[PDB]
Amino acid sequence: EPSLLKKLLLAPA
Amino acid sequence: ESADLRALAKHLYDSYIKSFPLTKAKARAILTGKTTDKSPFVIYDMNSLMMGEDKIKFKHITPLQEQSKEVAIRIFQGCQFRSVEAVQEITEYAKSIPGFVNLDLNDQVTLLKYGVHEIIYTMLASLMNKDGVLISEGQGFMTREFLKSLRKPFGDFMEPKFEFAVKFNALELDDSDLAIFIAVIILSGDRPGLLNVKPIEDIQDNLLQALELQLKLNHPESSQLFAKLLQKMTDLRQIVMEHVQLLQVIKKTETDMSLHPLLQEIYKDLY
Ligand SMILES: CN(CCOc1ccc(C[C@H](Nc2ccccc2C(=O)c2ccccc2)C(=O)O)cc1)c1ccccn1
């Protein structure tokens, strides 16, 4: 369930 | 006023160059042959797809050819693989749009969710001519005829993107124009479920002013090009919605063709 888009948005750089 | 709009245009272009390896300039150089690189491998049928497999970026359990005994599904799988990476590129770009990462994270998600495919289809036109599309960073050219020959609904996916691209490419935008245009698509304040619209619209107002200025300066002989480009934004939504219905056909009729979870997340409750 954890958003993969959030993961990509929070990833640095 | 316009001083920062030129800086914004340049910032976006620089970010665009950092985010998208195969720019429209590179793609046109390949498609017109004005490159010293070797001609892309032309994939026009089953056999050529098999020989060109080495040119289609595809990292999976087995080689692309072993994904299925059927050409259409190999194409489906390679295209899915590309789309996942396309989404990642567009996300990196979005994070460079000034103000974007200061928005509510849930709104950043929503803007990405509804914007990414519109941007994918916009940028696919950069890689297309009337006869096919560059793939894998210009490592392979897949013919429109071949894609149209795939059995239904597989053969229906790309043709509306080619039809869009031929008309869109007639605007003759370059990467510097495209960098602002796709930023405008991302910062759309009318996406469903946005929690706080004003900050998004404020950013989009600035982006729209920079786009209009950029188009006037870069295309002085193309009166109302801004107006013409704005009229294409709505075509992109129809393409997305039509693409969804085709993915729905796959989902209702084919076995073992679940989408990558990133694509499932994007598509879940889309519209
Ligand atoms: C066509 N092309 C360049 C990239 O084209 C894109 C065309 C469309 C997209 C968007 C993406 N599409 C798909 C997602 C999963 C599976 C198939 C598709 C197709 O769209 C598809 C289906 C059947 C037949 C052909 C395509 C999406 O919705 O996320 C992203 C990229 C390919 C094709 C094969 C391998 C690599 N490069």
Numbering used by the authors:
A (entry chain C): 140 to 152
B (entry chain A): 235 to 505
Reported in the publication:
PPARγ (peroxisome proliferator-activated receptor gamma) is a transcription factor of the nuclear receptor family that functions predominantly as a heterodimer with RXRα. PPARγ is a key regulator of glucose homeostasis and adipogenesis. The recruitment of coactivators by PPARγ is primarily determined by the interaction of coactivator LXXLL motifs with the receptor LBD. Helix 12 is key regulatory structural element in the activation function 2 interacting with coregulators.
